[PDB]
Amino acid sequence: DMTNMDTRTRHLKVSNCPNNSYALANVAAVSPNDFPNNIYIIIDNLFVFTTRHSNDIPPGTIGFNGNQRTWGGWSLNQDVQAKAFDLFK
Amino acid sequence: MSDPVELLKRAEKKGVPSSGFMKLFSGSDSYKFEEAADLCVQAATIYRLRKELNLAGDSFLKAADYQKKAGNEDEAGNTYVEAYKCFKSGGNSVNAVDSLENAIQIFTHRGQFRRGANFKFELGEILENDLHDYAKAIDCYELAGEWYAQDQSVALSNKCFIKCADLKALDGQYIEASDIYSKLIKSSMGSLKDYFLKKGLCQLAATDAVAAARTLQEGQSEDPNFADSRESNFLKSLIDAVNEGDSEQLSEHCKEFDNFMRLDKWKITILNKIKESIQQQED
Amino acid sequence: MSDPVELLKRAEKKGVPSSGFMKLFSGSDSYKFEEAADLCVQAATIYRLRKELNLAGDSFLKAADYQKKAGNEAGNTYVEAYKCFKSGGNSVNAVDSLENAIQIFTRGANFKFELGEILENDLHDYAKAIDCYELAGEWYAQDQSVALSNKCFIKCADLKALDGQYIEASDIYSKLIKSSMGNRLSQWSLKDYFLKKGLCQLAATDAVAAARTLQEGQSEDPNFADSRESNFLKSLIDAVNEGDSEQLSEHCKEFDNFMRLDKWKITILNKIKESIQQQEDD
Amino acid sequence: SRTAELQAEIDDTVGIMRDNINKVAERGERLTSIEDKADNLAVSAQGFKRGANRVRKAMW
């Protein structure tokens, strides 16, 4: 249910993926304090990913794998903008 | 020849400061300390002549301490240099480091930052090669380069900064090493060909490919020599390889670069960490 | 460590000369000035240890003034003031310190060359830099140091040509040519000298003198005769003679293609082309 | 033949420069030595000035 969620923008650091399983799932691993679980979030108004709760990533940081970085051309520790996404609208 | 042990005993006997009632009738204790230092120096020269370098270093150290107590700081620093000298020849790196530290402090306190910088560079060399204390060596090299810069000695500061940047990059501090390489480039504008390359390599060890590309462009546009140099092509190839995430292509470029210009252990480590960063990216 | 402010206050207290009745019983004031200078030097070394370079320079300056009052070291302290002011980014105080040190020494030439460098790069006072370089070269010549005087004269001629004084720059280039003739180490310098001289003579609309310089260089220095610089100078002379600005531009591009031009030459040839345009207006 | 002569001249000049590079090492060392004795000299000169002044005051 994506009807209600905080859409406020957050600036998050790109860091190495926590492990191979998270990279395989291709889901943005976020802390519970960052965003709700199992919701679509857009980044830079271009890159959409599904959030999953992860206690290994501290709040204010976003995890990416190598392929997502290749797609966005991002380096480690780069700052990116994240917001809530609504494809249906 | 006099017995060095007897001379040291006499120096110790004379090195006792006047205390209590005797202080009201005894002159300045500086002369007693000077005589004790002379006796220690004699005993220590006898020891060095016997190739007992460590005992001679200890005796110079005692003489330097007595000279400090006498107020003759410059003689104490020279004797400390002698202590470091003989300890290094004797294989006692720790006592050599200590002697260099006292000599450096004495010289800096007297405005001789040049002597301090020379001996700080020697101390950093001792730390890096003999004791493997890489952080202290980095600190010593940075300080020596800074003081040399304060003396307008561009080349020694450049040497000290080369050593500092090399150790810092090998120590995981890629950003600081790249900054020192930028300083070297700015001081050396008008080593550069390599500097640019090394800087870029450090920026690529930090996964900042954009900064490496910026460094390459700056080197190409500012230094015509670097633009047509093989180092520039190699750096561009490495930047392209990291951009495409093709580790094998990076290895091929490294082998090609080695075939014409042999790589050094510093570059080996940087590129190994870069390839392992690609492997981490692969994870 | 002692407070540098307290040391400076003590130095100021001791730096007051004896006045009135006290002067009849107080010894020479030189010792008081020496003590004040020592206190200032201590406070200033403390400032330097704290990287407060400007305050340390001011304290060396006070110590140098006290040393002057004592009859001594003041110039060296002025040199230290120059060093720390330059490291601290205070170009004006560095210039002042170099001036007092130069006056005391008159070393004067070295610090005059450094002063000219400071004026040219930091303060952009090109006239004073030209004066400093000329004076430094003259004193170096008086010491028979041919190469240092030659360096100072190169700087002076470069700035003078960039400053609109083409004739004087050409004269200095002639002096450089005469001093460097017969020396195997400075051959290339000569090869450029001739060219530069001719260029200056061509910036002054004086094509005949440029041709004379080219002929003199060709006949006197065999290396210059076959050098690319000689051909380029001859081509420029021919272009100015025919008044073909485009031909001059083509020759400049050809010269750049094999030997990169520098900003000095760019300016000289730009003024020359603008002079052709002025002739076209004429 | 021209390139071989050029190579020979370059080798000779490298020879001269390493020799010159060995002399400048001896020169840097000597300069450190002469900056150690000149510091001593400055200190001794100041000490002599002060001592002579103290004797001047004594005789007065």
Please characterize this protein's 3D structure:
The structure is cut from a larger assembly and holds one copy of chain A (89 residues), two copies of chain B and one copy of chain D (60 residues). Chain A is an alpha/beta fold. In chain A, 15% of the residues lie in helices and 33% in strands. Chain A has helices at 20-25, 66-72; strands at 10-15, 28-30, 40-43, 47-53, 61-63, 79-84. The relative contact order of chain A is 0.33. Chain D is an all-alpha fold and 60 residues long. Chain D is rod-shaped. Chain B binds chain C through residues 111, 150, 152, 224, and chain C through 45, 83, 87, 260.
Instruction: Look at the helices and sheets of chain A and give the structural class.
Output: alpha/beta
* Overall morphology of chain B: elongated
Shape, principal axes of CA atoms of chain A: globular
Helix and strand element order of chain B: HHHHHHHHHHHHHHH
Number of helices of chain B: 15
Let me know the largest β-sheet of chain A.
6 strands, mixed
* Largest interface chains and counts: A-B, 13 and 13 residues
Strand proportion of chain B, as a percent range, falls in under 5%
Quaternary assembly: part of a larger assembly
Q: Give the N-terminus to C-terminus distance of chain A in angstroms.
A: 14 Å
Radius of gyration of chain A: 12 Å
- Per DSSP E runs of 2 or more residues, the count of β-strands of chain B stands at 0
Report strand order across the widest sheet of chain A: 2-4-3-6-1-5
Helix content of chain B: over 70%
Main beta sheet of chain B: strand number and arrangement? none
User: What are the secondary-structure elements of chain A, in order, as H or E?
Assistant: EHEEEEHE
Fraction in helix of chain A: 10-25%
The span between the termini of chain B is 73 Å
Estimate what percentage of residues of chain A fall within beta strands. 25-35%
PDB class: translocase
Keywords: snare, NSF, Sec18, AAA+, translocase
Entry title: Y20S (Sec18-Sec17-Sec9-Sso1-Snc1) EDTA - Class 8
Chain A: Vesicular-fusion protein SEC18
